Design an enzyme around this catalytic site. Structure first.
Site, PDB file in Angstrom:
ATOM      1  CG  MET A 147      -2.048  -1.009   1.166  1.00  0.00           C
ATOM      2  SD  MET A 147      -3.152  -0.850   2.582  1.00  0.00           S
ATOM      3  CE  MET A 147      -4.436  -2.017   2.146  1.00  0.00           C
ATOM      4  CG  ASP A 148      -0.090   4.110  -2.984  1.00  0.00           C
ATOM      5  OD1 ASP A 148      -0.850   5.022  -2.596  1.00  0.00           O
ATOM      6  OD2 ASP A 148      -0.409   3.291  -3.870  1.00  0.00           O
ATOM      7  CB  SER A 149       0.902   8.146   0.408  1.00  0.00           C
ATOM      8  OG  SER A 149       2.304   8.214   0.592  1.00  0.00           O
TER       9      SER A 149
END
Ligand SMILES: CCCCCCCCCCCCCCCCCC(=O)OC[C@H](COP(=O)([O-])OCC(O)COP(=O)([O-])OC[C@@H](COC(=O)CCCCCCCCCCCCCCCCC)OC(=O)CCCCCCCCCCCCCCCCC)OC(=O)CCCCCCCCCCCCCCCCC
Ligand SMILES: CCCCCCCCCCCCCCCCCC(=O)OC[C@H](COP(=O)([O-])OCC(O)COP(=O)([O-])OC[C@@H](COC(=O)CCCCCCCCCCCCCCCCC)OC(=O)CCCCCCCCCCCCCCCCC)OC(=O)CCCCCCCCCCCCCCCCC
Ligand SMILES: CCCCCCCCCCCCCCCCCC(=O)OC[C@H](COP(=O)(O)OCCN)OC(=O)CCCCCCCCCCCCCCCCC
Ligand SMILES: CCCCCCCCCCCCCCCCCC(=O)OC[C@H](COP(=O)(O)OCCN)OC(=O)CCCCCCCCCCCCCCCCC
Ligand SMILES: CCCCCCCCCCCCCCCCCC(=O)OC[C@H](COP(=O)(O)OCCN)OC(=O)CCCCCCCCCCCCCCCCC
Ligand SMILES: CCCCCCCCCCCCCCCCCC(=O)OC[C@H](COP(=O)(O)OCCN)OC(=O)CCCCCCCCCCCCCCCCC
Ligand SMILES: CCCCCCCCCCCCCCCCCC(=O)OC[C@H](COP(=O)(O)OCCN)OC(=O)CCCCCCCCCCCCCCCCC
Ligand SMILES: CCCCCCCCCCCC(=O)OC[C@H](COP(=O)(O)OCC[N+](C)(C)C)OC(=O)CCCCCCCCCCC
Lengths: 161, 95, 141, 192, 506, 105, 80, 78, 183
Positions: B41-43
């Site tokens: 998961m990114d930001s």
């Protein structure tokens, strides 16, 4: 054709289906009105007007309290009931409407014989006032004592300071 | 009446179900499963999951906790410690 | 006292009220004779609430604080006091001085509650906000 | 049971106050000053705040005296009432009562006195006020009317007792005394 | 005296400035009023004169020797209660200022005392309804006197609804009697005692049974007593029973004229259930006031057995039991209020929350009272052993006289059950004693610098500062020794109960 | 002694006399028991409810049914509508069957 | 239909609905009193009926005030 | 007398809002009026059944007591 | 006072419908052992006009009938039948005399009462002519007991309360007697 039966049947139907608090205070009004009208005829016109004078003022104070408490709870809460079962419940309650089981007292009519001995005729309210202020003046004074307690009681419960 | 009825196993079970509705890398999620590495998961993807987890348990992560949470177990611990039932009207309790 | 004439009037009054609604329902032209925007149950832009032009939050079932709730509650004990004076109105002569003294003592007890309300200032409107001036003081060293 | 002669089952408010003994005023005065004294006594026993004695404010002293003033009078009123009821020694009160009644009878005046109340109201007032002193500690109620239900017979005032021969009182028959039930219903039996 | 002085206090309280000191001094004024009321009542009312029974106020009220005794008891117990709010109970502002915060405290008490005294004297069904509402309304106001407390307002809401239903039942019973006979005066109704539906009077008693927390209507009483503050629970759990039980005895006295066996069985059925719930109910509880609420229910059941019998021995049993139970009730609640000064201060598991309204809320908060204050602990032990019924304490003679009336009238089942219930209730009674003293020898060599009393500053380090104020400690000392040393004057006190007559005469 | 059964005009009603005689019997010293006053109590309760007299009417109606007697042959004529208390029913010499005026007296 | 406690369904599910039920129940007793007094031609029963109306009105005021303060306590922060 | 004026409005508004619910109540109301007006005796039979099953003195029970007395008195005379 | 009762006609037919009132007639006369009497045929207005003349003429029979009622100890209706018939005949005789000696003055008075809500204060002019005629032909005088003779309200010269609308027949008859009788 006793139309009082139909009015009470309609009132009873809405009592079982009433959901929000506004419909409950409407039930109270739909209860005092048959009482007042049935009192206005038949038994006592005096207390039919007394019921209107006192309870209607209480209804408005009751209504204004509802506006400060309604919290969306009954606007989306679901009810299930069922049309068939509600009619069945009201139908069975309609079957028995004999509040007393003295058949002779309910089926045999009686009369009274008027007399001319009471040349001084006045309303029932004057006789009530005559006894309430003379024979039972203690009850009247204690009632005022209770009213005094309510005035003090309301202030201490409600007032923040 | 107004008390938490959650358990560590039930909270973890529902946390996994919410996270499996996304495009995570792995469907094997436990307490030690990290969002950044194991789930990929990114930001913005992480913040989408956090808000989705907020909706399930009716809780709100604070700014400091949300900006420093790393593993699913930390999410489970936060839900257990902070969850409260929403206050009902006067009629629900006393009637 | 005969009240058959009164009963007919009450019947007419009830029927009269329905005539105003029935006339208005049968006199207005149908929507198709008008701009034909359909039934009112579908014209949601018309049946919606009025908020001076701009729609706002829907707070139909939100609580409404009342600043005169104590005055509303105090109305009930005083309404009963006034109602209890009805028996004395039509029996003033028969009760004589005895009833007059009892009637005065009845009011002399309720006047204590009236005095109590005056001193407690319970009739004033309650307010959440309070306006107080603050004196500016300098902590000179 | 210490029983004495019955004077008046429902004595009038003025009669009770007039028949006060010097001790009755003494108990009235003690009640008036006792309540402020009790507030001083309570502070001495245990101060309201702190550990040292502090005199209660004069505003408390003023209201305490008013409470004691009514409390003392009620105590005195009850003590005098028992003499009329006969529950207490009332030889002094019997002699004074008999002199007043015989004097009123000699003048063809009702010992109870003329009343503004009609026959129904006089009886009604007596029912409300009779034996109301038993609850005087709870709430007040006094006989402030000239009714004729006092639970005594005016015949007993015709017999001459010791020390009353020199009173030289001539007593006409009761049917010639004004404002008496036995001397009112002359024309109609339902109207005095 | 009560009515006239109440009006003066109402006006005076609203005129002077709002302060804790003035409220406390006004509370002392109320103490003088009740003391003056007692002196006036004792001056005019005597046991011998009232033996026949005297009607008052157009026969609306009827006072006899039986009624007069309860009125004197009501005034005396109210005097001891006002001492709690008229003086310090702990000497600490953080605790004691609660009693001085509400100015209308003394006013509401004086309103209720008028209702309490007049209720046993009612001689008309109209004044019966008026007085019972006057007493009921005053209790609702006192339960809601602390309007900033969530529990106090919740309890008053519960109290109002349950009592209003009971008032409706009472009104429904009196109206049904009027329909059958057309008369409102009780003495006139007694002329037709053999021709009216005697079960309508059972409907009247059902409304009165609700107001005293009798089973199956016990549940609301336990809930209200536990949630209400200890200073409020001390009054509302005892005072209503002083007047309503006396009125129930009078009504049962009239009912026994026709001697309806079916009426007795229904009341016996409710007494049997109340002994079961009263005994087993308190076995698993952790709150002290909840425990006392079950104790109150059980003891009322014991008195109802005497009331149900309604014989000469019942008058002796009821009068003695109600007097000694009230003194024990005052003594226990007086000790509970005081011993709050020995509570440890946190400086957590179970997240226990204790509020200023009920500083003592759990039975285990009484731990180490034997070490903290040996004299107070023994005083509580004497009171608890009295509730158990250990002779020769006041409690044993109360149960001894109740058993005499029950077995004389043939209530063998209830007498055996009341003794099994007494043994079952001894379990939770002994639990209080276990908490007080059973760990004394292990905690004797312990250090407690974190107690509430330790926060009280010293004066000069040389003054001998007592831990408890003069008035409340003296009341506990007096009541404890009266309970303990009743054997000295027991014979004469029962002789006084011999002379209390309810139309017996000969 | 408080007043009971007061009529709508301040005086005794129909059943006060029965109640008064009950009180006099019960408070009379010459009686040893309340048995002599039992008959007076029944009369007062009969004055208010008329339960025994209604029962007697029930028997007469039921007895006539088994005998085949028609109710209109042994009963009393009655009118159910006040506006139809016509002068023909009242027996006036020139009595007509036109309805009487009951709207405004 | 009364013995199965049918009236417990006719009462709504709000606290104020319980208050309305009590007022109706007390009003039934007053109507019965007026019914008996009018038949007997007894003004004493009408005195009782008037008292029941006044007393029941006092009960409503006290109960409402408790319910008003109870609702006030929950919405009592008033930080705004 | 207020219900006299209110009754036409509430009845009309009842059918306009709930025509089927009002029809059942009105139909039930009229059926029991027809039973009492036409002396069909449906409600009387239910009342007699209730009094018999609950131990109340019924119309037939009261009449049987009279028959027993009448038979006894006649035998005593003859 | 318009309180509904079971002894007379109620306020409206709706009261009858709720009470299921039956207006019951009896077709049986009094038994032959009771002597028959002629009932008074005067309506409300003539009776109120002749109320004080019946009392003056039949005072001893009114008192005797009422004294019979009190001394009958509850059996008044049956025992005092004989005394009741004396009052009925005496009252009928007064009305018969009023129709033979003062018919014009009598009819003027009770027709005024029907015109003025049956209130005595609104027909002083007609009553004064009637009172004078009865005294001069029957030696009967209206008297209100319990008050001094000169303080009777019907003899008051300037009453505070007077009729709103004058009765034209009374006004004309009063003027016809002012100029003629008092020259
Ligand atoms: C008159 C003034 C008065 O006597 O009271 C002082 C008091 C002084 O008012 P203040 O100057 O603002 O008080 C300043 C200090 O607090 C005043 O402090 P304080 O301690 O001096 O006043 C407290 C007062 C306590 O006040 C009361 O108890 C008055 C209660 C009356 C009811 O106690 C006393 O002073 C005792 C003497 C005065 C009361 C004697 C009343 C006897 C009973 C009658 O006045 C009142 O209490 C007014 C209440 C009555 C108003 C009039 C009501 C009339 C009702 C009938 C009308 C139809 C006729
Ligand atoms: C839960 C709450 C419960 C409710 C509690 C609320 C409170 C209720 C109880 C209130 C007190 C009970 C009264 C209830 C209503 C009674 C109404 C009534 O019967 O009036 C009839 C009464 C007429 O009856 P009556 O047969 O013609 O008797 C005339 C005098 O009352 C009799 O003439 P007299 O020989 O007695 O003397 C006449 C003259 C004094 O002239 C004299 O010649 C007396 C000679 C000895 C003087 C001794 C002085 C004693 C006074 C200090 O003035 C007086 O002394 C009248 C006595 C009353 C003194 C003031 C009352 C203090 C009460 C506190 O109407 C009045 O005018 C009474 C005047 C008294 C003042 C009003 C009394 C209430 C204040
Ligand atoms: C008086 C003439 C003018 C008024 C006529 C209005 C007729 C409507 C019904 C009147 C009341 C009859 C008895 C019913 C008791 C109250 C029940 C109620 O809440 O009102 C009924 C109304 C119907 O709408 P409905 O959607 O079916 O109900 C909600 C379903 N969840 O649901 C509603 O909530 C709408 C409420 C609108 C405002 C009505 C306020 C009460 C009116 C009482 C005045 C009449 C007195 C009672 C007369 C009949 C007595 C049975
Ligand atoms: C008349 C009613 C008011 C009484 C007036 C007399 C009084 O109160 O004396 C005043 C005195 C208070 O002393 P103080 O306030 O220091 O003097 C003024 C200083 N600038 O007051 C005191 O010292 C308190 C001693 C008691 C005062 C009299 C209390 C009785 C009041 C009359 C009661 C009548 C019933
Ligand atoms: C305060 C205590 C005052 C005691 C007064 C007792 C009393 O009221 O009189 C006894 C009463 C019967 O009295 P009676 O027969 O009517 O007349 C004869 C009186 N010699 O009989 C009764 O009804 C009284 C019943 C209650 C008995 C209470 C016993 C005393 C309670 C303990 C007092 C503790 C004192 C604490 C002191 C605190 C202040 C430091
Ligand atoms: C020699 C000296 C003798 C001294 C003692 C004399 C008395 C001895 C009494 C013997 C009976 C009690 C002992 C045995 C009971 C054991 C209870 C028990 O085992 O469990 C409780 C039982 C439910 O069983 P469960 O909870 O599932 O436990 C697992 C069982 N395999 O729960 C139940 O099912 C019990 C039945 C339901 C409760 C019934 C209560 C009705 C009243 C019982 C009598 C109480 C009388 C009290 C009288 C005063 C109060 C009115
Ligand atoms: C047209 C239809 C009309 C129907 C009306 C009734 C509606 C249905 C209600 C069910 C009936 C139960 C109530 C019946 C009346 C109350 C009981 C009663 O009074 O007895 C009547 C019945 C027969 O009485 P009987 O002996 O024949 O004649 C009297 C002679 N002296 O004696 C009986 O045996 C009746 C049955 C009573 C015994 C069973 C009920 C008690 C046991 C179960 C209790 C369940 C609820 C418990 C609640 C307890 C709360 C404290
Ligand atoms: C008092 C005032 C009198 C003057 C105004 C009268 C208006 C009513 C006549 C009308 O509406 O006539 C036009 C109508 C129909 O046409 P519509 O416009 O669609 O009817 C709409 C009106 N509804 C709702 C009754 C259908 O014709 C007819 O057949 C009338 C029957």
């Amino acid at each position: 054709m006793n139309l009082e039966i139909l009015d009470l049947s309609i009132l009873g139907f809405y009592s079982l289906i009433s959901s929000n608090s506004f419909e409950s205070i409407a039930i109270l009004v739909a209860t005092i009105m048959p009482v007042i009208t049935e009192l206005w005829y038949n038994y006592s016109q005096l207390f039919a007007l007394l019921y209107t004078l006192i309870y209607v003022g209480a209804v408005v104070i009751l209504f204004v309290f509802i506006l400060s408490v309604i919290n969306e709870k009954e606007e989306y809460e679901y009810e299930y009931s069922g049309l068939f079962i509600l009619i069945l419940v009201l139908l069975l309650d309609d079957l028995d409407d004999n509040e007393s089981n003295d058949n002779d007292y309910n089926n045999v009519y009686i009369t009274d014989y008027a007399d001319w001995f009471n040349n001084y005729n006045e309303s029932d309210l004057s006789v009530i006032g005559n006894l309430l202020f003379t024979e039972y003046a203690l009850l009247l004074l204690i009632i005022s004592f209770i009213l005094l307690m309510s005035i003090i009681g309301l202030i201490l419960i409600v007032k923040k300071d | 009446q107004s008390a938490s009825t959650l358990t560590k196993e039930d909270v973890l079970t529902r946390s996994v179900s919410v996270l499996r509705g996304f495009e995570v890398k792995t469907k094997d999620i436990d307490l030690q499963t990290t969002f950044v590495q194991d789930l990929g998961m990114d930001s913005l993807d992480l913040n989408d999951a956090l808000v989705a987890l907020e909706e399930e348990f009716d809780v709100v992560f604070d700014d400091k906790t949300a900006n420093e949470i790393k593993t699913v177990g930390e999410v489970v611990d936060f839900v257990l410690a902070n969850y409260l039932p929403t206050e009902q009207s006067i009629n629900h309790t006393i009637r | 006292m005969l009240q058959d004439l009164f009963n007919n009037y009450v019947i007419l009054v009830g029927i009269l009220g329905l005539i105003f609604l029935g006339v208005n329902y049968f006199i207005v032209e149908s929507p198709r004779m008008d701009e034909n925007n359909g039934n009112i149950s579908d014209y949601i832009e018309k049946s919606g609430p009025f908020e001076c032009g701009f729609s706002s939050f829907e707070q139909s079932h939100n609580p409404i604080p009342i600043a005169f709730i104590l005055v509303a509650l105090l109305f009930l004990p005083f309404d009963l006091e006034v109602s209890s004076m009805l028996p004395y109105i039509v029996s003033i002569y028969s009760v004589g001085i005895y009833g007059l003294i009892i009637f005065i003592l009845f009011l002399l007890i309720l006047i204590v509650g009236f005095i109590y309300e005056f001193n407690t200032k319970s009739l004033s409107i309650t307010t959440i906000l309070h306006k107080k001036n603050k004196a500016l003081v300098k902590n000179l060293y | 049971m210490e029983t004495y002669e019955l004077i008046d089952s429902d004595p009038k408010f003025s009669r009770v106050v007039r028949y006060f003994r010097p001790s009755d005023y003494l108990t009235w005065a003690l009640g008036t000053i006792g309540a402020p004294g009790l507030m001083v006594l309570f502070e001495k026993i245990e101060p309201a705040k702190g550990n040292t004695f502090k005199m209660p404010p004069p505003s408390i002293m003023r209201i305490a005296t008013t409470i004691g003033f009514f409390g003392g009078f009620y105590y005195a009123y009850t003590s005098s009432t028992k003499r009329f009821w006969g529950y207490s020694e009332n030889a002094k009160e019997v002699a004074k009562d008999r002199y007043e009644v015989k004097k009123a009878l000699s003048e063809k005046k009702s010992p109870y006195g003329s009343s503004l109340l009609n026959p129904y109201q006089q009886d009604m007032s007596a029912r409300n006020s009779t034996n109301s002193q038993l609850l005087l500690a709870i709430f007040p109620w006094f006989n402030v009317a000239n009714h004729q239900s006092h639970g005594i017979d005016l015949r007993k005032y015709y017999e001459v007792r010791d020390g009353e021969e020199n009173w030289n009182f001539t007593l006409p028959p009761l049917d010639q005394v004004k404002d008496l039930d036995v001397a009112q219903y002359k024309e109609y039996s339902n109207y005095p | 005296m009560l009515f006239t002085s109440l009006l003066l206090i109402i006006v005076y309280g609203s005129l002077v400035n709002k302060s804790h000191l003035l409220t406390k001094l006004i509370n002392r004024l109320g103490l003088i009023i009740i003391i003056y009321t007692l002196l006036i009542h004792l001056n005019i009312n005597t046991l011998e004169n009232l033996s026949i029974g005297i009607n008052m106020f157009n026969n609306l009220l009827l006072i006899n020797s039986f009624n007069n005794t309860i009125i004197e008891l009501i005034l005396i117990i109210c005097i001891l209660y006002v001492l709690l709010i008229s003086f310090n109970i702990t000497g600490l502002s953080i605790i004691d200022n609660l009693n001085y915060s509400k100015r209308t405290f003394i006013v509401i008490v004086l309103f209720n005392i008028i209702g309490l005294t007049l209720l046993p004297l009612v001689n008309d069904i109209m004044i019966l309804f008026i007085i019972i509402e006057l007493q009921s309304y005053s209790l609702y106001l006192l339960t809601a006197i602390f309007n900033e407390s969530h529990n106090s307002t919740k309890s008053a809401l519960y109290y109002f609804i349950v009592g209003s239903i009971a008032s409706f039942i009472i009104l429904d019973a009196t109206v049904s009697i009027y329909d059958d006979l057309g008369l409102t005066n009780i003495q006139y109704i007694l002329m037709y005692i053999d021709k009216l539906e005697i079960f309508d009077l059972l409907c009247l008693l059902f409304g009165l049974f609700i107001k005293i927390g009798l089973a199956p209507f016990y549940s609301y009483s336990i809930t209200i007593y536990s949630l209400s503050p200890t200073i409020i629970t001390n009054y509302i759990s005892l005072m209503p029973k002083l007047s309503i039980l006396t009125l129930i005895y009078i009504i049962m006295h009239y009912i026994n004229i026709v001697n309806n066996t079916d009426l007795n069985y229904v009341i016996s059925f409710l007494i049997l259930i109340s002994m079961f719930i009263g005994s087993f109910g308190g076995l698993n509880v952790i709150r002290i006031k909840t425990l006392l609420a079950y104790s109150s229910l059980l003891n009322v059941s014991y008195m109802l057995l005497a009331i149900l019998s309604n014989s000469n021995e019942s008058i002796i049993a009821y009068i003695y039991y109600i007097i000694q139970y009230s003194l024990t009730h005052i003594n226990i609640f007086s000790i509970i209020l005081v011993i709050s000064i020995y509570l440890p201060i946190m400086n957590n598991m179970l997240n226990v929350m204790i509020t200023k309204y009920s500083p003592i809320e759990y039975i285990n908060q009484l731990k180490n009272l034997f070490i903290n204050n040996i004299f107070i602990a023994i005083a509580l032990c004497i009171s608890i052993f009295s509730l158990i019924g250990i002779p020769p304490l006041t409690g044993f003679y109360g149960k001894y006289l109740v058993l005499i009336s029950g077995l004389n009238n043939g209530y063998v089942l209830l007498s055996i059950v009341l003794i099994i219930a007494s043994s079952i209730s001894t379990v939770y009674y002994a639990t209080i004693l276990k908490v007080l003293s059973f760990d004394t020898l292990s905690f004797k060599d312990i250090i407690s610098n974190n107690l509430i009393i330790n926060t009280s500053p010293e004066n000069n380090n040389n003054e001998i500062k007592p831990e408890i104020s003069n008035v409340i400690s003296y009341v506990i000392s007096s009541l404890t020794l009266i309970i303990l040393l009743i054997i000295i004057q027991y014979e004469n006190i029962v002789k006084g109960a011999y002379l209390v007559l309810l139309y017996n005469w000969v | 002694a408080p007043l009971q059964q007061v009529g709508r005009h301040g005086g005794p009603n129909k059943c006060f006399g029965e109640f008064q005689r009950v009180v006099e019997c019960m408070t009379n010293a010459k009686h040893d028991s309340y048995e002599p006053c039992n008959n007076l109590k029944n009369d007062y309760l009969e004055c208010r409810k008329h339960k025994v007299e209604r029962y007697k009417a029930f028997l007469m109606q039921k007895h006539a049914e088994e005998l085949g007697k028609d109710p209109e042959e042994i009963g009393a004529p009655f009118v159910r509508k006040r506006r139809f208390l016509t002068s023909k029913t009242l027996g006036l010499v020139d009595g007509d069957d036109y309805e009487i005026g009951v709207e405004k007296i | 239909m009364d013995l199965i406690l049918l009236m417990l369904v006719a009462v709504g599910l709000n606290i104020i609905d319980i208050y309305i039920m009590i007022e109706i129940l007390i009003m039934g007793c007053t109507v019965n009193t007026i019914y008996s007094a009018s038949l007997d031609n007894d003004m004493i029963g009408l005195i009782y009926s008037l008292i029941q109306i006044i007393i029941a009105g006092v009960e409503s005021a006290i109960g409402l005030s408790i319910l008003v303060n109870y609702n006030r306590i929950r919405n009592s922060e008033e930080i705004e | 007398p207020y219900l006299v004026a209110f009754r036409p409005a509430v009845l009309v508004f009842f059918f306009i809002r709930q025509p089927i619910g009002a029809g059942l109540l009105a139909g039930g109301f009229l059926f029991w009026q027809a039973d009492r007006h036409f002396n069909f005796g449906i409600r009387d039979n239910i009342h007699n059944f209730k009094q018999t099953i609950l131990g109340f003195p019924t119309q037939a029970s009261k009449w049987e007591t009279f028959k027993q007395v009448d038979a006894q008195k006649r035998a005593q005379l003859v | 006072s318009s309180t509904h009762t079971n002894d007379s006609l109620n306020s409206s037919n709706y009261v009858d419908k709720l009470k299921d009132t039956h207006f019951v007639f009896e077709n049986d006369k009094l038994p032959s052992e009771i002597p028959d009497v002629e009932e008074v045929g005067a309506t409300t207005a003539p009776l109120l006009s002749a109320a004080y003349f019946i009392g003056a003429k039949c005072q001893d029979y009114n008192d005797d009938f009422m004294l019979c009622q009190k001394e009958a100890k509850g059996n008044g209706p049956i025992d005092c039948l004989k005394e009741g018939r004396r009052v009925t005949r005496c009252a009928s005789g007064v009305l018969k005399d009023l129709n033979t000696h003062c018919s014009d003055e009598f009819r003027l008075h009770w027709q005024c009462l029907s015109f003025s809500n049956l209130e005595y204060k609104n027909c002083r002019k007609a009553e004064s002519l009637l009172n004078k005629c009865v005294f001069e032909k029957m030696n009967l005088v209206k008297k209100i007991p319990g008050i001094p003779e000169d303080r009777q309200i019907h003899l008051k010269q300037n009453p505070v309360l007077k009729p709103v609308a004058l009765h034209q027949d009374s006004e004309v008859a009063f003027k016809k007697a002012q100029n003629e009788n008092s020259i």
